[PDB]
Design an enzyme around this catalytic site. Structure first.
Site, short mmCIF file in Angstrom:
data_model
loop_
_atom_site.label_atom_id
_atom_site.label_comp_id
_atom_site.label_asym_id
_atom_site.label_seq_id
_atom_site.Cartn_x
_atom_site.Cartn_y
_atom_site.Cartn_z
N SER A 55 0.82 -1.21 -0.07
CA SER A 55 0.04 -0.08 0.02
C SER A 55 0.82 1.41 0.14
CB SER A 55 -1.16 0.01 1.06
OG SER A 55 -2.12 0.79 0.64
N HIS B 43 -4.38 -1.23 -0.10
CA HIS B 43 -5.43 -1.29 0.56
C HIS B 43 -5.44 -0.01 1.61
CE1 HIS B 43 -2.40 -1.21 3.77
NE2 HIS B 43 -1.92 -2.32 3.54
CA LIG Z 1 -1.66 2.14 6.85
#
Ligand SMILES: [Ca+2]
Ligand SMILES: [Ca+2]
Ligand SMILES: [Ca+2]
Ligand SMILES: [Ca+2]
Ligand SMILES: [Ca+2]
Ligand SMILES: [Ca+2]
Ligand SMILES: [Ca+2]
Ligand SMILES: [Ca+2]
Ligand SMILES: [Ca+2]
Ligand SMILES: [Ca+2]
Ligand SMILES: [Ca+2]
Ligand SMILES: [Ca+2]
Ligand SMILES: [Ca+2]
Ligand SMILES: [Ca+2]
Ligand SMILES: [Ca+2]
Ligand SMILES: [Ca+2]
Ligand SMILES: [Ca+2]
Ligand SMILES: [Ca+2]
Ligand SMILES: [Ca+2]
Ligand SMILES: [Ca+2]
Lengths: 192, 192, 186, 191, 187, 189, 193, 193, 185, 192
Positions: free
Chosen positions: B96, B121
Site C-alpha cells: 500500500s 489497501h
Molecule cells: Ca496504513
C-alpha cells in the site's frame, strides 16, 4: 467429615472454607481488586447462588476496587438488577469507575460508604487496532458504551446525562459527603 | 554488509557506499518497510538531488512489501514539492504505502517490471485511551483514509468511490492490471 | 586514502565488485536483495556491455525476495553469468537458473535444490482467501520462470518442486538449471 | 583488530592486519567454519587469483569446529582457483577445517608440532513430515559420501577406511596425520 | 592523512606500539584474540625476520588449547619473541611467558604468575566420552612437556605442581624457570 | 575528496550533513533531548557560518516532549538568522511548537501535512510534598506552552488553553487560519 | 479473585462446593472468558453430566464471553443439540462471535440477554503457514468452517445464508433490541421474570 | 478455568468428584487437547480402571483433539485393543491425525461423530538431529511408524494400505459424511428430528 | 467414603490398589523414587502377590533406571513388566529386568536400547575420574542386559553402541521380552 | 508452608490453618506489606469476628514494614465500623501504614513489645499523564495527605500541624517515644 478452615486459600484453590466463603453464608459478597471478567463472573455467580437460597433477603455487596473496566462491571450491574433480592452496596475503601457504577447501582436507599472512602468516576476507556473501517465500527460501539454508562449513572443519581457526561470527562473524585450530594450513595456510615 | 565504490574524482580518490554512488546517477532506493526513518532519508535524498540539479529527473526505485500510509504521506508530498520530475519504478514489491509512491510519480513516468507485485489497501491505525480521545483519533483516521483515496483517484483517473471500494480489502494487481488501473504507465521487460 | 579491510571501509567484496563480481550469499531476503540489485545497476552504469558475475552461495530464503533480483537480472543490459559456488536452495536456484543462456555453472560439490513457494497468512477468512490466491499466483510465476530457463514443461516443474528436490551438479545440467560444471576454472 | 599504515605516493593508506597479510597472499581460516566466514575466505582466494593467478596462496587454519557443508564451498573454491593453495594448520583443524587442510595442494599441506587434527562424519538434522525426512536423510547420506570421497582422494586411503574412522571423533597427532596422508609434513620452526 | 585514536570505536594505540614490534596479549586467552596475536607476529616477521618481537602479557585466564596455537606460532616465526608479564599470567598466559626465547622472559615486581593443569569437558555417549578423555589426557601431557622443556623441570615435577592452582611470586618464577629475570625499572 | 560519501550513517559524510551545507536542518522522529541538542548545535554552527542567511528547519515529528522542544524553541529565537520552518509530514505537539515559532511569514507546510497540538504531559512519583512541587512546575510549563502558541498565532492564551485540552488536529488550511503557519505550498515557490 | 466455597451443613455431616459446582446443582452452567478448547470441553462435560442426572429438565447456559475461536465453539454447539435437555441461553454480559453462536444456538424461544448485554458476530478467523499446497488445503477448510458458521446462524435466526454472510463480513455489533429483531435471541429480560 | 465438582450419595456416605471423574462413573473418558504422553497415560489408566470395574461393559471415548503426535496416540490405540471392553468412540468436535487414529480404532460399528465435527488425517511427523549414522537410524524408525499408521487405518477402514498412504501424504480433511464413506467412523449422530 | 475422587484416590492411586504402577515420561530421579516407593508400599501390603509395572517411557537416564531395577530385584514380589507404548534405553532396562516369563509388550510398542550417556566438566584429573566411572556404569548396563536376555556381554555392547530399535517380535527374539499380547491374555 | 491444627469440635474433628485457629481466639494477623489483597483479607476477618460476637474485643497483631496508606485506609475504617473494640499490638514493625492501624486501635488498647519499631510518614503517590489530569490527582493526594494527619491527630491528641511537620520525613519512634507521642498506650515485655 468436617470442612477445614483457612483464612486464605492456598495457591491451588483447595476446597477449604475460606473467610470470604464464611461471609457468603451471611449473604455478603466482596467485590475487590481490579474489576475484570474473572472476578466479575464469580460475583455474578454468588448473587445467583444467594438468590437461589433466598430470593427475598437482601444481598450485601462490599466494594473495594481501585480500578478496572466498565464493560466488565456492566455484566455485574445487570446481574444486580436481574436477581430478585435488593442488593445493598457498601464501599469499604475505594470505588473507582467500574466499582462506583456498582456502588451507585445498588437498591434505592441502600447504598453507603465509610468516612474515608474514595469514590471516583470517569468515562469509559477503550482501544482498537486494524483497518480504518473496523476502527470506525469499534469507535461507534465505544460511543454506545459511553452513553450507557452516562444513562445508568444519571438514572441512579438523579442527574442529567449531560451533567454526568460533563463530570466523567476526566477523573472526578468525590468525598463521601460529595457522593451523598451527587446521589451516588444514600448515606455514610459515620463513626458512632 | 554495504559495499563501497571508490571513484576517481578530479580532486582525488573518493569512497561511496553503493547507494551514494547510484545517487550520483540520480537514483534513489526506497526499500523495506515504509516507516519514518527511511521516509526521511528518502526525502532528504530528493532535496539533495533538487539542490544539485533542479531540472534533471529523479529516479525512485521501489521495493517495499509493507509499512504505514502516514509515513508514505511525507514522501508523496516531497515528490510533488521538488522541482524535478520523479520517475518511479517498482523493481519487486509495492504494497500500500509503496503503491502510493509508485502511482504518484510524474505522468507517463511510472513503471514496474514483469514479476512486480502491486497491492493497495485502506489505511490502518489504532488508538487506546478515553472514549473522547478514541473519537478524536477515529476522525483523523477517517481523514487520512479519504486522503489516500483522493491521491489514488487523482493519479489513476478512477473515481474516489471506485478507489474506496477497491481498497476496502487487500487488492493485488498484476503489472498488466496496474497499467489498466492507472497506477503505472507501462511495464519494462528489459531496459528501454 | 580509503582504508583497506577484508571485512567491516573498502572491503574484500568491494574490491571484487571492481572486477564485476557480485556475491549473493546467506538467506535471500529483502535487505541483501536490494543491495545485490544496486550493484547490478551500478555495474550496468559503469559498462552496460561487459558481463556481470553473480556468485551464489545461499542455503535458503524467500522466493518473493529472489523475484526482484531475477527481474533486475533480465532488466539490466549486461549478460549476467551465474555460478553456484556452494549452495543454491530454492530462491538461490531461481537466480542460478535465470542467468544468461550458456553462462550458468556450478562447482563439483555444489548443492542445488528447488521447491514450491512458502507462505502464510493470519486473519479473517475473506483475507485468507485473498492471500491464498496471491500465493498461488506467485507459485505459478516460479514454475513459469524455471520452465522458461530450463526448457521443462510448467507441469513437470510443478510436480518436481512439490517437495524439496535436490539435484547433483550433473542432474542440474541434465535438468537445464545450469549449463555446465567447472572442475577448475577454464 | 590492529591497523597497519603504509606510505604511498598519494598519502598514507591504512590496512587492518589481515588485509596486510593478504598482501603476502596469506588467508586466515579461523573460528567456526560457517557460511559468513567461508564466503569471506572464498572472496579472498578469488582476489588473490585476480592479483596473480600463478603465485601460491597460503591458507592458515585454526578452526575447532563448524559445518562440513560450509567447508565444501571453500574446498571447491580451492580446486577452482588457478593458484596452488598451500595449507598450514597453526592450531586446530576440526572436521570442517581438516577437510580444507587435507585439500591443499600435493606436497604443500602442513602443521605445527602441537597442532590438533580431528575428523568426523557429517552432522545434520531435519524436522517435518516423514516424506520430507526421507528426502533430507538421503541428501545427508550423499553429503556424507562426498566427505569420504574427498578425504579418500587427498589422503590415499580408501573410502571404506575413511568412513570407518570418521564414524566417531577421530583425533590425529601431527605424526599420525602425516602417516594418514592428511598432511605432508610438520614444521618445527619456519623452514 | 590517517586519523589518530587511543581506542577503537582509525590508527589506535596498539597499532602504534605494533610499529615498535610490541604485541599485547591481554584478557582471556581464547581463539579470537589468539588468532589476532598470531597474525601480528606473522606481520612483524614479514616486516623484518631478524628483529626481536615483544609480547607483553596481561592475562588472568583462558584455555590452554587456545594458547597452544600462539605458542607454536612463537617457535615458528624467525624472530626471537621476548616475553614480559606486566600484570597477570594465568596458566595459558604463563605457558606463553614461559615459551619466550631463552634469556628473554621477564615480569615486573608485582606480577602474578600461576600455572595449573588443563581444563576440559564433554557430554554425550560413553564411547565419545572415552575418546575425548584420552585427547584431554594427551593435551595435559603436552602442557607438562612444554613447561618442563622451558623451565628445566622434570615432567613429573611439573605434573605434580600443576595438579592444583599453583601461584608463583616473581622470584619463585625465576627460581622455577618460567622466567629469567625481574625488572623493577626498564633496564 | 578524502571524505567518504554515504546515504546513511551507521564518520562519513551523510545526506543530512550535505543538506546542512545548504543551511537545512532536519527535525525528525520523536522530539527528545538527544536529538534536540543536535538540532540546537546545528543552529549554532549555521549562525557561526553566516549570521545573516536564513536557517531552514524541516519538521517531520509524530511526537515527543514539549520540555525538550522548549530548548530548541529558545535556540531559534536566540540565534541571529531567521529560522524558516516547513512541516514536511507530521507536526505533533512538540513539533508544532517549533513549526509555529519560526520567523514571521516563514512558516509553512505541504498539502497533506498533519499538524496537531495538545497540552503538556508529565508525571512524578514520591512523597506528597514533592508531588505538589512537581505539579506546580508542570502547571508552569503548561502555561509557557499556551503563552508561546498565543504569541505566534495571535490567539488568546485562554483560547489556546481550551484548544489544547485534548489532541487537536488541524488541516493545513485550518493551521493557516489558526495562525500556526503562514502558508501552504503545493509545489516549491 | 479466588473461587468462593459453599458449605452445606447437614445432620449427616457437611459437604463443600465451589460456587460453580453449587450452581451446577441447579442446572446452571457458566460459559465465560475466551471460548477455547479447555473450557469448551469442561462445558460439554457439564452438559453431559446434567443430561445424565435428568434428561428432561432444561439446562441453563449463562454466557459472558468477549471472544475466542469459532472452531472451539462448534464442539459446544454440537453438544447442545446432541444432549436431550432443552438448552436455555442467557447472555449476562458479552457474547462475541463464538459466544454469539452458542447464544443463538439455544433451544427455540429460550434464548435471552440482559438490557446492557453486547452481542457481536463476525466471520471465522484462521491462519496457516507452510508450502503453497498446504496453504491451499487449509484455506479450503477455512472456507468450509466459515460456511458452516453462516448456515448455523441462518438456521437459528431465520435469515438467509447470504444475508448472514454479508452481515458477518466485518464485526457486527447488535443491541439487545436489534438481536431480537435479527433473531439471535427471543427476548430481553429487564428483571428475572 | 477450573474443574467443577459434584457430590454423590454413596454406600458409606457422600463423596466428591471432579466432573470428569463423575463421568468416569458412567464409563465415559474424555480425550481432549493435544495428544501427548501425559494425557495419553491418563487415558490409558482410565481405561484400565474401567476394565477392572467391569470387563464386559462398553467404554466410551469422547474425542476432541486438534493435534498431537501419532507416537503418543500409538499407546492409547494399543490399550484400546488390549482391554476387554468394547471401546465406543465419538468425536465431539475435532479429530486431527492422532485423534483420528483413535476414532478409527474404536470397536466395529461403534465409531461416530457429530454433524459439525472435523476429522483430519495425515502422515507421521518426526525429526532428529545429530550424526549422519544416527539420522539414518531414526529415519528408518520413522518409516516404520509411518507404515504402522497406514496399516492401522487400513485395517479399520477397510481401505488398501497404498490408498491410505496416498491420501495422508498431506493434510486430508474429511466431512462427517466423507468420514463415514471413508470407513473412519460408522455413523453420524444427526440432530434429532 | 469421605475422600474425594479425581482423574488428575487419583486415578493412578486407584490402580495402585490393583498392584499396578505406572512408569511414564522421562526416567529421572524424581519419578524413579516415586516408582521405587510404590514398590515398597506394594511389598508391604502383600509381599507375595505380583507387582505390575506398566512402562511408557520415551527417554531418560540409565543411572536413574539403575535404582528402579535394583529395587525391582530387591522387593519380594515378582515384578511383571508390560510396555504399553515406548520403552527407550532407560525404560528398556526395566522392561528387560522384569521377572522371568513375565515381560511383555503390545503390538505397536517401540523398544529401543543404547549405551549410557553422561559428561563432565573440570580439571583433567577429574575428567579421568568420571570417565572411568562412566565406563563402569556402561559395563553394568551391558551385564544387566546380558543377564536378562541371554546374550553375550560383547554382543550387547556392540548392539547398544548406537540407538538400536527392536520390533516387538525382534525383542522377543532378542530376549528383552517373553511375549507380545494382542489383547489381554 | 502454613501449619494445620486439628481440634475436637462438638461435631467432630476439624482442621484449621494456624491463622483460622487463632481466629477462634479473636486474633487477626496484619503482616507484610499493606496492600489491597491482604487488607481485604483482614477486613473480612474483622467482619467475621463481629458476626460471631459483636461485643468481644478483636485482637489485631501488627508486623508490617511498609505499604500504601490508601490500602490501610480501608482497614482503619473497618476498625471504626465494626462494633467490637479492636485492641492493637505491634509485635515487631509498624511502618507508616501499619502505624496508622496501630494508632487507630481502641482507646487504652494500643500496645507494642520492647524491641518494636514504629515509624510514620506522609503519603506517597504518583501519576503520569496530561497536565490537567496531573493537577486532579495532585489535589486528591493532598486530600489523602490531610486525612492521614487528621486521623493521627485525633488518635494521638497532637495538633494536625504538629503531625504534618513530624511526618514530613520518615519519623521513627521507640516504644517509649510512641507512648509519649500517643500512638500507643503501653508497652508489654511479658504478657500480663
Ligand atoms: Ca496504513
Ligand atoms: Ca473503562
Ligand atoms: Ca435486585
Ligand atoms: Ca516533482
Ligand atoms: Ca541481462
Ligand atoms: Ca557437519
Ligand atoms: Ca588450486
Ligand atoms: Ca621464534
Ligand atoms: Ca585449559
Ligand atoms: Ca632454576
Ligand atoms: Ca509533553
Ligand atoms: Ca532567530
Ligand atoms: Ca438439546
Ligand atoms: Ca474464529
Ligand atoms: Ca477392546
Ligand atoms: Ca505425528
Ligand atoms: Ca543414560
Ligand atoms: Ca522381585
Ligand atoms: Ca470498633
Ligand atoms: Ca503511602
Amino acid at each position: 467429615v468436617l470442612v477445614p478452615m483457612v483464612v486464605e486459600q492456598t495457591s491451588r484453590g483447595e476446597r477449604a472454607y475460606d473467610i470470604y466463603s464464611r461471609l457468603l453464608k451471611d449473604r455478603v459478597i466482596f467485590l475487590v481488586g481490579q474489576v475484570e471478567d474473572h472476578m466479575a463472573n464469580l460475583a455474578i455467580a454468588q448473587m445467583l447462588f444467594l438468590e437461589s437460597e433466598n430470593p427475598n433477603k437482601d444481598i450485601n455487596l462490599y466494594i473495594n476496587s481501585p480500578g478496572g473496566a466498565v464493560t466488565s462491571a456492566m455484566a455485574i450491574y445487570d446481574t444486580m438488577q436481574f436477581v430478585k433480592p435488593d442488593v445493598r452496596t457498601l464501599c469499604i475503601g475505594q470505588a473507582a469507575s467500574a466499582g462506583a457504577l456498582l456502588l451507585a447501582g445498588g437498591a434505592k436507599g441502600k447504598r453507603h460508604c465509610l468516612p474515608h472512602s474514595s469514590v471516583m468516576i470517569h468515562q469509559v476507556l477503550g482501544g482498537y487496532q486494524g483497518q480504518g473501517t473496523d476502527i470506525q465500527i469499534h469507535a461507534k460501539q465505544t460511543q454506545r458504551v459511553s452513553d450507557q454508562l452516562n444513562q445508568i449513572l444519571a438514572k441512579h443519581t438523579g442527574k442529567d446525562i449531560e451533567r454526568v457526561e460533563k463530570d466523567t470527562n476526566r477523573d472526578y473524585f468525590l468525598t463521601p459527603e460529595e457522593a451523598v450530594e451527587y446521589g451516588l450513595i444514600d448515606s455514610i456510615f459515620k463513626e458512632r
